[PDB]
């Protein structure tokens, strides 16, 4: 399932601390074995040194197949552990 796959792929790609994620694709008339449509939240030490928009544009342009490989539509939120530890 694409949530276990994107978990594994992002753990190979950007070395996470933490994730909270969901598929929305049970909302659509999509074929059996299809999970087209997705949401992610992520914490990683790889997301500091950056503006929030700057890092988002970096995942969206760099990692388009690494996020959206088996998923024809998805959205992210990307975070740092010191922000997540305190308040988000």
Curated annotation (Swiss-Prot):
Widely expressed. It is found in: Mitochondrion. Keywords: Mitochondrion, Phosphoprotein. The modification Phosphoserine is found at residue 51. It comes from the Eukaryota. The keyword ATP-binding does not apply. GO terms for biological process: cell redox homeostasis; intracellular iron ion homeostasis; iron-sulfur cluster assembly. GO terms for cellular component: iron-sulfur cluster assembly complex; mitochondrion. Belongs to the BolA/IbaG family. Interacts with GLRX5. Acts as a mitochondrial iron-sulfur (Fe-S) cluster assembly factor that facilitates (Fe-S) cluster insertion into a subset of mitochondrial proteins. Probably acts together with the monothiol glutaredoxin GLRX5. May protect cells against oxidative stress. This is BolA-like protein 1. It comes from Homo sapiens. The chain holds residues 31 to 118 of 137 of the full protein.
């Amino acid at each position: 399932p694409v949530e276990a796959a994107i978990r594994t792929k992002l753990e190979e790609a950007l070395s996470p601390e933490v994730l909270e994620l969901r598929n929305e694709s049970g909302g659509h008339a999509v074929p059996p074995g299809s999970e087209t449509h997705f949401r992610v939240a992520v914490v990683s030490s790889r997301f500091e040194g950056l503006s929030p928009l700057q890092r988002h544009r970096l995942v969206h342009a760099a990692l388009a197949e690494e996020l959206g490989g088996p998923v024809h539509a998805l959205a992210i939120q990307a975070r740092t552990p010191a922000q997540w530890r305190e308040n988000s």
